[PDB]
Ligand binder design. Structure first.
Ligand SMILES: C[C@@H]1CNc2c(cccc2S(=O)(=O)N[C@@H](CCCNC(N)=[NH2+])C(=O)N2CC[C@@H](C)C[C@@H]2C(=O)O)C1
Lengths: 29, 10, 257
């Protein structure tokens, strides 16, 4: 219920951090 | 080192 | 954090600092799972072999920090502990099995752009994210090097450091230590032939090992910075507390209902 995991200055602002994609790509290898 | 925090906590 | 980077502001809003009153010093990392609960590693509060045994009155909790040493008046929040809970079967004598601990804040904290809770995984999430080869992220204010030339520099970072490490196949972990690893642990790090480095290190303990769900765009805390053999050594990896396995205990302690 409680929202969590959504960063107020990132996710919520539709911006992504500098190395976040490394995480993501590691899934679709 | 550390900058000092309010003494009420210390 | 070894071979990591400066984190961006507000990059880990759930990152908590465990501060020691006197002497004033950084004890460990930790995370905010909610408005009043903090999740850290047991060995941060209790390690008999070194006469380590902190209590609710010896520590402080600093949430919303970026800089390691500054007193960030406008952004951080300093809380006092109401009660500490260590896993009853935490094995500090042999392998640190069940290295988990919860801390109950005295007063709820106010969420902000800098202070936000991280999520705890469920069966499917844990099931699909915890797969060797997949990357996780570690954050902390601990040593930048396992070792270094005294007085010629500063082993500690100015701001929060971040590193992304891949999960390693169980068998591989098992073969790297003489230590008895349990199902309550997991390992991460690059392999010697991998061409990359990085590790958590002293001062990073208790810190969170998180992962991002592509489908729901949320961060999940899959592990806790636990133990290791030195920092950033080849053919060695970091060991994290398996948060998912210990969820029932957390659940039992918290009692939201
Ligand atoms: C089963 C562990 C294995 N190793 C150790 C133990 C106890 C003290 C020190 C060591 S260590 O110096 O090898 N490594 C540190 C730090 C390693 C950091 N690297 C990493 N996390 N990848 C350690 O694990 N610790 C855990 C126990 C605590 C008391 C001391 C120390 C810590 O401060 O990190 C028991």
């Amino acid at each position: 219920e409680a929202d969590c995991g959504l960063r107020p200055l990132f996710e919520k602002k539709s911006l992504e951090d500098k190395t976040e994609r490394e995480l993501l790509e590691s899934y679709i290898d | 080192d550390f900058e000092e925090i309010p003494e009420e906590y210390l | 954090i070894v071979e990591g980077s400066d984190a961006e502001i507000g990059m880990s809003p759930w990152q908590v600092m465990l501060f020691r009153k006197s002497p004033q010093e950084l004890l460990c990392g930790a995370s905010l799972i909610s408005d009043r609960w903090v999740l850290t590693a047991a060995h941060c509060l209790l390690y008999p072999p070194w006469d380590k045994n902190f209590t609710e009155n010896d520590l402080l909790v600093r949430i919303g920090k970026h800089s390691r040493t500054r007193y960030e008046r406008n952004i951080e929040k300093i809380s006092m502990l109401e009660k500490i809970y260590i896993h009853p079967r935490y094995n500090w004598r042999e392998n640190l099995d069940r290295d988990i601990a919860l801390m109950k804040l005295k007063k709820p904290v106010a969420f902000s752009d800098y202070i936000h809770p991280v999520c705890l995984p469920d069966r499917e999430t844990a099931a699909s994210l915890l797969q060797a080869g997949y990357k996780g992220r570690v954050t902390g204010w601990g040593n930048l090097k396992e070792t270094w030339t005294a007085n010629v520099g500063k082993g500690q970072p100015s701001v929060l450091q971040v590193v992304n490490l891949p999960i390693v196949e169980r068998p591989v972990c098992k073969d790297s230590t003489r230590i008895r690893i349990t199902d309550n642990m997991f390992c991460a790090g690059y392999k010697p032939d991998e061409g990359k480095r990085g590790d958590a290190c002293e001062g990073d303990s208790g810190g969170p090992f998180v992962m991002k769900s592509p489908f729901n765009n949320r961060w999940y805390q899959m592990g806790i910075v636990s133990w290791g053999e030195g920092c950033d050594r080849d053919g060695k990896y970091g060991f994290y507390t398996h948060v998912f396995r210990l969820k029932k205990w957390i659940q039992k302690v918290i009692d939201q209902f």
